[PDB]
Design an enzyme around this catalytic site. Structure first.
Site, PDB file in Angstrom:
ATOM      1  CG  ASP A  45      11.803  -4.185 -30.057  1.00  0.00           C
ATOM      2  OD1 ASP A  45      12.899  -4.843 -31.219  1.00  0.00           O
ATOM      3  OD2 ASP A  45      11.815  -4.414 -29.007  1.00  0.00           O
ATOM      4  CE1 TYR A  50      19.691  -7.951 -33.510  1.00  0.00           C
ATOM      5  CE2 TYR A  50      18.213  -5.946 -33.333  1.00  0.00           C
ATOM      6  CZ  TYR A  50      18.715  -7.439 -33.166  1.00  0.00           C
ATOM      7  OH  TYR A  50      17.521  -8.443 -32.660  1.00  0.00           O
ATOM      8  CE  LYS A  71      14.085  -6.957 -27.850  1.00  0.00           C
ATOM      9  NZ  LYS A  71      14.669  -6.422 -29.477  1.00  0.00           N
ATOM     10  CG  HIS A 104      18.592  -9.442 -26.251  1.00  0.00           C
ATOM     11  ND1 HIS A 104      19.196  -8.562 -27.540  1.00  0.00           N
ATOM     12  CD2 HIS A 104      18.155 -10.309 -26.935  1.00  0.00           C
ATOM     13  CE1 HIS A 104      18.913  -9.074 -28.841  1.00  0.00           C
ATOM     14  NE2 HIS A 104      18.047  -9.793 -28.994  1.00  0.00           N
ATOM     15  CG  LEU A 186       5.926 -11.603 -41.144  1.00  0.00           C
ATOM     16  CD1 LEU A 186       6.402 -10.592 -42.384  1.00  0.00           C
ATOM     17  CD2 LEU A 186       4.731 -11.752 -41.378  1.00  0.00           C
ATOM     18  CB  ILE A 224       8.465  -5.646 -33.736  1.00  0.00           C
ATOM     19  CG1 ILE A 224       9.079  -6.843 -32.851  1.00  0.00           C
ATOM     20  CG2 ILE A 224       7.990  -4.712 -32.683  1.00  0.00           C
ATOM     21  CD1 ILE A 224      10.213  -6.385 -31.699  1.00  0.00           C
ATOM     22  CE  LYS A 226      15.543  -6.638 -41.972  1.00  0.00           C
ATOM     23  NZ  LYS A 226      15.307  -7.350 -43.494  1.00  0.00           N
ATOM     24  CB  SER A 227       9.685  -4.444 -44.092  1.00  0.00           C
ATOM     25  OG  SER A 227      10.200  -4.798 -45.191  1.00  0.00           O
ATOM     26  CB  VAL A 228      15.620  -3.490 -45.748  1.00  0.00           C
ATOM     27  CG1 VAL A 228      16.147  -2.306 -46.877  1.00  0.00           C
ATOM     28  CG2 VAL A 228      16.042  -4.035 -44.529  1.00  0.00           C
ATOM     29  NE  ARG A 232       8.783  -7.739 -49.458  1.00  0.00           N
ATOM     30  CZ  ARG A 232      10.005  -9.130 -49.830  1.00  0.00           C
ATOM     31  NH1 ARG A 232      10.738  -8.752 -48.686  1.00  0.00           N
ATOM     32  NH2 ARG A 232       9.350  -9.891 -50.623  1.00  0.00           N
ATOM     33  CG  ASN A 236       4.600  -6.365 -42.997  1.00  0.00           C
ATOM     34  OD1 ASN A 236       4.236  -6.446 -43.997  1.00  0.00           O
ATOM     35  ND2 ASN A 236       5.939  -6.273 -42.825  1.00  0.00           N
TER      36      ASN A 236
HETATM   37  N1  LIG Z   1      14.344 -10.441 -29.017  1.00  0.00           N
HETATM   38  C1  LIG Z   1      14.993 -11.389 -30.020  1.00  0.00           C
HETATM   39  O1  LIG Z   1      16.055 -12.055 -29.110  1.00  0.00           O
HETATM   40  C2  LIG Z   1      15.346 -11.189 -31.659  1.00  0.00           C
HETATM   41  C3  LIG Z   1      14.746  -9.923 -32.008  1.00  0.00           C
HETATM   42  N2  LIG Z   1      14.327  -9.901 -33.557  1.00  0.00           N
HETATM   43  C4  LIG Z   1      13.249  -8.914 -34.417  1.00  0.00           C
HETATM   44  O2  LIG Z   1      12.863  -9.968 -35.115  1.00  0.00           O
HETATM   45  C5  LIG Z   1      13.173  -9.599 -36.619  1.00  0.00           C
HETATM   46  C6  LIG Z   1      13.271 -10.874 -37.002  1.00  0.00           C
HETATM   47  O3  LIG Z   1      13.835 -11.169 -37.963  1.00  0.00           O
HETATM   48  P1  LIG Z   1      12.589 -11.364 -39.181  1.00  0.00           P
HETATM   49  O4  LIG Z   1      13.036 -13.785 -39.319  1.00  0.00           O
HETATM   50  O5  LIG Z   1      13.299 -10.956 -40.744  1.00  0.00           O
HETATM   51  O6  LIG Z   1      11.561 -10.978 -39.086  1.00  0.00           O
HETATM   52  P2  LIG Z   1      10.332 -11.339 -39.691  1.00  0.00           P
HETATM   53  O7  LIG Z   1       8.975 -13.039 -39.393  1.00  0.00           O
HETATM   54  O8  LIG Z   1       9.159 -10.187 -39.288  1.00  0.00           O
HETATM   55  O9  LIG Z   1      10.719 -11.325 -41.363  1.00  0.00           O
HETATM   56  C7  LIG Z   1      11.539 -10.109 -41.915  1.00  0.00           C
HETATM   57  C8  LIG Z   1      11.994 -10.712 -43.473  1.00  0.00           C
HETATM   58  O10 LIG Z   1      10.364 -10.514 -43.835  1.00  0.00           O
HETATM   59  C9  LIG Z   1      10.445 -10.010 -45.150  1.00  0.00           C
HETATM   60  N3  LIG Z   1       8.936  -9.633 -45.306  1.00  0.00           N
HETATM   61  C10 LIG Z   1       8.892  -8.448 -43.871  1.00  0.00           C
HETATM   62  N4  LIG Z   1       7.654  -7.276 -44.598  1.00  0.00           N
HETATM   63  C11 LIG Z   1       7.045  -7.903 -45.751  1.00  0.00           C
HETATM   64  C12 LIG Z   1       6.005  -8.498 -46.585  1.00  0.00           C
HETATM   65  N5  LIG Z   1       4.953  -7.727 -46.452  1.00  0.00           N
HETATM   66  N6  LIG Z   1       6.264  -9.303 -47.610  1.00  0.00           N
HETATM   67  C13 LIG Z   1       7.064 -10.181 -47.726  1.00  0.00           C
HETATM   68  N7  LIG Z   1       8.199 -10.844 -47.116  1.00  0.00           N
HETATM   69  C14 LIG Z   1       8.024  -9.502 -46.184  1.00  0.00           C
HETATM   70  C15 LIG Z   1      11.739  -9.383 -44.699  1.00  0.00           C
HETATM   71  O11 LIG Z   1      12.556  -8.666 -45.494  1.00  0.00           O
HETATM   72  P3  LIG Z   1      12.698  -7.032 -46.124  1.00  0.00           P
HETATM   73  O12 LIG Z   1      13.718  -6.365 -45.377  1.00  0.00           O
HETATM   74  O13 LIG Z   1      13.635  -7.068 -47.033  1.00  0.00           O
HETATM   75  O14 LIG Z   1      11.264  -6.712 -46.468  1.00  0.00           O
HETATM   76  C16 LIG Z   1      12.181 -10.657 -43.773  1.00  0.00           C
HETATM   77  O15 LIG Z   1      13.512 -10.762 -44.987  1.00  0.00           O
HETATM   78  C17 LIG Z   1      13.723  -8.216 -36.465  1.00  0.00           C
HETATM   79  O16 LIG Z   1      13.544  -6.985 -36.561  1.00  0.00           O
HETATM   80  C18 LIG Z   1      14.309  -8.251 -35.024  1.00  0.00           C
HETATM   81  O17 LIG Z   1      14.529  -6.714 -34.117  1.00  0.00           O
HETATM   82  C19 LIG Z   1      14.867 -11.265 -33.813  1.00  0.00           C
HETATM   83  C20 LIG Z   1      15.779 -12.199 -33.520  1.00  0.00           C
HETATM   84  C21 LIG Z   1      15.617 -12.065 -31.917  1.00  0.00           C
END
Ligand SMILES: NC(=O)C1=CN([C@@H]2O[C@H](COP(=O)(O)OP(=O)(O)OC[C@H]3O[C@@H](n4cnc5c(N)ncnc54)[C@H](OP(=O)(O)O)[C@@H]3O)[C@@H](O)[C@H]2O)C=CC1
Length: 271
Positions: A45, A50, A71, A104, A186, A224, A226-228, A232, A236
């Site tokens: 996604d 972005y 989006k 979006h 999360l 969906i 997110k992880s880098v 993780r 997930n």
């Molecule tokens: N439609 C919309 O308007 C929007 C959509 N989004 C989407 O949703 C996501 C939102 O971001 P965010 O709040 O970070 O999303 P999440 O709730 O998916 O949390 C992601 C965060 O948690 C960490 N994390 C992921 N997996 C684990 C794990 N197994 N154990 C511990 N920590 C973990 C990540 O760090 P790390 O990456 O280092 O693992 C990252 O900082 C984005 O991917 C985006 O695509 C976001 C904003 C708006």
């Protein structure tokens, strides 16, 4: 233990867990996408916001099987503008026909989301896109677009996590056969240290993250995360090997909060 999929009212099907790409630059984006595909992600996604659809496009190079969602950003709303934006996205993604295209944000003050939805309806009618949906739409906005077109979005992608469970909006979705997709599943990672979640995690010998994603899955939600981190990312996805019981599901349901929203409110968002 097979991955699950969710099917739309329009007969198309989407993997129930996908990769949330965020504001990764194009080059790093390609490598994240390639790694996630190697790991077993079947869905990716992204968003015009972005500026990394080129990276995703290159990361999905020999992977036409991967479900691809993007989006339309706010400043491309409008009938003609959305047609142009979709075609640009398909080019940058190197996939002539995308699997899912979303508006979006509704951005009610713009007064353009209805004409934007008509563009999406036309993209679907002409075979330019497989499925169409929205993101961050409230029930009123959903009503407006359905009334204007007679065409129901297959998905509404909304902020949803154990602190903010979107129960009322999900009841509306249910009524219209709209699927719910959870972004921020999360809750920024905050829930991962919650004691109630920790106890459920110990109960199943899974991580708090795995508990929470499994909770979304058991609610029929597309998720969906997110992880880098490759570790993780792998973790997930490892969520088809256990089942949260009724007690577990109730316990997470109780975490819902009136003040749980962490992102912008659709009704007031200004960018
Ligand atoms: N439609 C919309 O308007 C929007 C959509 N989004 C989407 O949703 C996501 C939102 O971001 P965010 O709040 O970070 O999303 P999440 O709730 O998916 O949390 C992601 C965060 O948690 C960490 N994390 C992921 N997996 C684990 C794990 N197994 N154990 C511990 N920590 C973990 C990540 O760090 P790390 O990456 O280092 O693992 C990252 O900082 C984005 O991917 C985006 O695509 C976001 C904003 C708006």
């Amino acid at each position: 233990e097979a991955q699950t999929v969710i099917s739309f009212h329009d007969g198309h099907t989407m993997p129930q867990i996908g990769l949330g790409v965020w504001e990764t630059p194009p080059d790093e984006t390609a490598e994240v996408v390639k790694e996630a595909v190697k790991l077993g992600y079947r869905s990716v996604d992204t968003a015009r916001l972005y500026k990394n659809e080129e990276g995703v496009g290159k990361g999905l190079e020999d992977h036409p099987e991967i479900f691809l969602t993007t989006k339309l950003w706010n400043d491309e709303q409008g009938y003609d503008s959305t047609l142009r934006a979709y075609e640009e996205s398909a080019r940058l993604l190197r996939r002539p026909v995308l699997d899912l295209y979303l508006i979006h944000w509704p951005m009610p003050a713009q007064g353009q989301y209805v004409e934007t939805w008509k563009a999406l309806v036309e993209l679907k009618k002409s075979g330019r896109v497989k499925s169409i949906g929205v993101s961050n739409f409230e029930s009123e906005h959903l009503e407006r677009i359905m009334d204007a077109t007679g065409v129901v979005p297959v998905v509404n992608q909304i902020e949803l996590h154990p602190d903010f469970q979107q129960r009322a909006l999900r009841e509306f979705h249910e009524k219209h056969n709209i699927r719910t997709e959870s972004w921020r599943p999360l809750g920024k990672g905050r829930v991962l240290s919650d004691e109630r979640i920790g106890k459920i995690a110990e109960k199943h010998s899974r991580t708090p993250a795995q508990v929470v994603i499994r909770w979304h899955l058991q609610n029929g939600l597309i998720v969906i995360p997110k992880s880098v981190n490759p570790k993780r990312l792998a973790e997930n996805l490892d969520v088809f090997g256990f089942v949260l019981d009724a007690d577990d599901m109730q316990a997470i349901e109780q975490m819902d909060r009136k003040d749980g929203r962490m992102g912008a409110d659709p009704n007031t968002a200004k960018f």
